């Protein structure tokens, strides 16, 4: 924190586990919520979660913003309705100033060449319109799930659109 | 008709694994004066904890057959130990020779087997033209029609010399 | 490291369908005197190969030395001389549009 020089893509690939080790584990609980198995897809009421932005939310971003989300999805009696889906994973690894590579801004260090930033965190990135994490059930209430994501958004760097079913 | 009938192609006895004729070249002696020929084979799989870690292995294995040598052998062969001569014992293909198998990785291989029926006997049964499949050329495949059936297989041998049990 | 097989990656490589040996016909075909021939390296070749830089440009074949044909880009290198060194086999393709 804060996430600033973290989620703007001004770099290019990898993740690559070959290349990198010492990746921190994600603190993003399972990306399968609600009752799985049965096809939730048969449902009235629909979806949400549209990013409306560019990218790279960190696992710190998604994992408390998503279960936060689920927490107020609990209202629908624990195990009784909806499945929650998350889309993208936090693959993508980021490195931060370890003074040896270059100079100035991050992904630059001291000297020239040298320490790339040391591994510290991972974040998935997204596009202008992608569905961050969706799923629904019949209109349980007015739309508790719609209330969900109200809270879900408001912990994402992006401005997420609710998007109607 | 006669074509359809089942006869035994190559059987071949075998011996257990480990070195053979340890004290002196022996164990080949058995298999000798039995079956008429004298095979020997070798093995792969270097580190054996209580086996060798020899690569090219002296490992005993042997025998084969023909027509009529394994008849007059496989005569006074079967009618040896068979608590249950047949049943579940052999399987779809026709004949087998086994005992109790162990959980081992099987199936994705040419399928030679450890299985020991007698000093692991290998009656293999095939009807037909079958020399088709084996022979190098347009190999062809067995029909999966004119294929042996365990029921048919637990026939023929049984009709002669010994009960199925 | 540095060497003939320098950064090539795709240019040299021939993939899936055309893998293995190639037909003899290409490397047997003869060209005579000034004939414009393109240069490339068909992969699946291991001889009569030019460098890597300069591959793709046409040159004019000239006389043959040993089993290989003087050709190569007789043509200019960059905006420059037709300084030419040619040691290419028929294996690399000939012809003109």
């Amino acid at each position: 924190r804060p996430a600033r020089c973290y989620r703007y893509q001004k770099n290019k690939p990898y993740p690559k586990s070959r290349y990198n080790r010492a990746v921190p584990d994600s603190k993003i609980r399972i990306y399968d919520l609600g009752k799985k198995k049965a096809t939730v897809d048969e449902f009235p009421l629909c979806v949400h979660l549209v990013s409306n932005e560019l990218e790279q939310l960190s696992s710190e971003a998604l994992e408390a913003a998503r279960i936060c989300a689920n927490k107020y999805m609990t209202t629908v009696s624990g195990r009784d309705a909806f499945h929650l889906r998350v889309r993208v994973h936090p693959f993508h690894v980021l490195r931060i100033n370890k003074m040896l590579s270059c100079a100035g801004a991050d992904r630059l260090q001291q000297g020239m060449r040298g320490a790339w930033g040391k591994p510290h965190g991972l974040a998935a990135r997204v596009d202008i319109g992608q569905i961050i994490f969706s799923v629904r059930t019949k209109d349980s209430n007015k739309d508790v799930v719609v209330e969900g994501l109200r809270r879900a958004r408001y912990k994402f760097p992006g401005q997420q659109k609710i998007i109607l079913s | 008709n006669p074509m359809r009938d089942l006869k035994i192609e190559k059987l071949v006895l075998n011996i257990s694994v480990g070195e053979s004729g340890d004290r002196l070249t022996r164990a080949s002696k058995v298999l000798e004066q039995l079956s008429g020929q004298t095979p020997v084979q070798s093995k792969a799989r270097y580190t054996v904890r209580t086996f060798g870690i020899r690569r090219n292995e002296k490992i005993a294995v042997h025998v084969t057959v023909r027509g009529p040598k394994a008849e007059e052998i496989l005569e006074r062969g079967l009618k040896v130990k068979e608590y249950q001569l047949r049943d579940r014992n052999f399987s779809a293909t026709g004949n087998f020779g086994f005992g109790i198998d162990e959980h081992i990785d099987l199936g994705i291989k040419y399928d030679p087997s450890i299985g020991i029926f007698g000093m692991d006997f290998y009656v293999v049964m095939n009807r037909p033209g079958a020399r088709v499949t084996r022979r190098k050329r347009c190999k062809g495949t067995v029909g999966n029609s004119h294929k042996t059936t365990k029921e048919d297989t637990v026939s023929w041998f049984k009709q002669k010399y010994d009960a199925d049990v | 490291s540095h060497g003939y097989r320098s950064r090539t990656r795709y240019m040299f490589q021939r993939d899936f369908r055309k893998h293995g040996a190639v037909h003899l016909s290409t490397y047997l075909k003869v060209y005579k005197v000034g004939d414009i021939v393109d240069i490339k390296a068909n992969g699946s070749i291991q001889k009569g190969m030019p460098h890597k830089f300069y591959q793709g440009k046409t040159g004019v074949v000239y006389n043959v030395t040993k089993s290989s044909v003087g050709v190569i880009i007789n043509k200019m290198v960059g905006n420059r001389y037709l300084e030419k060194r040619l040691n290419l086999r028929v294996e690399h393709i000939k012809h003109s549009k």
Binding site: - | - | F16, R17, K18, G20, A21, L24, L28
Partner: protein, 222 residues
């Protein structure tokens, strides 16, 4: 087909006919009556039948000037099994003295011969009988020792055509002997293998085939 992600190699391939990576082998040595896209003194084997061909390739073609295939023999000669070596010495020998010098044999054509002083006249060829040639490719097959494939080569060698090959990778004789060992030159057929199966209990006659060969080397019809 498939997803077509793969490309399939076939031509002659797919179902087998020619090989490749062989039959390319043959070809380089330009042989045939004349320059050939692919040339051979093919030897094929069939159950109960042996065939000898011979001819340079065409773009579409793979023609054959003269053929053998014991089957036709006996045109003259005799009724016996054709699935043995003897009778696969005869042919490949009968083809020789057909392909081998009749329609034309090794590179002999009207007009000036290929560059090199070379003149061919009847009777023993001047400047060496060496120029006569064909390469014999067993098709898909297995090279063995004395094998009929080779045997096909043996006659259809002393038939005038001169093909490279390796001696000692032949049957010797006996299986297919020469009448007299001191003189290599002779038309010779033997079928010793089968013969002496029995001693001479009855049946097989090796003696008959020497008879055939006698006829072969001589002025015969086609």
């Amino acid at each position: 087909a498939y997803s077509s992600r793969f490309q399939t190699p076939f031509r002659r391939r797919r179902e087998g006919k020619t090989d490749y990576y062989q039959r390319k082998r043959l070809v380089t040595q330009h042989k045939a009556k004349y320059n050939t896209p692919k040339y051979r003194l093919v030897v094929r084997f069939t159950n109960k039948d042996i065939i000898c061909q011979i001819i340079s390739s065409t773009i579409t073609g793979d023609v054959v000037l003269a053929a053998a295939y014991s089957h036709e023999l006996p045109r003259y000669g005799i009724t016996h099994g054709l699935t043995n070596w003897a009778a696969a010495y005869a042919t490949g020998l009968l083809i020789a003295r057909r392909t081998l010098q009749r329609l034309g044999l090794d590179e002999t054509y009207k007009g000036v011969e290929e560059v090199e002083g070379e003149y061919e006249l009847t009777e023993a060829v001047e400047d060496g009988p060496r120029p006569f040639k064909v390469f014999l490719d067993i098709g898909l097959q297995r090279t063995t020792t004395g094998a009929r494939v080779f045997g096909a080569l043996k006659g259809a060698s002393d038939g005038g055509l001169y093909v490279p090959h390796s001696e000692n990778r032949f049957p010797g004789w006996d299986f297919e002997t020469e009448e007299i060992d001191p003189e290599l030159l002779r038309s010779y057929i033997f079928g010793g293998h089968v013969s002496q199966y029995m001693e001479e209990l009855a049946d097989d006659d090796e003696e008959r085939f020497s008879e055939l060969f006698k006829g072969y080397l001589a002025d015969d019809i086609d």
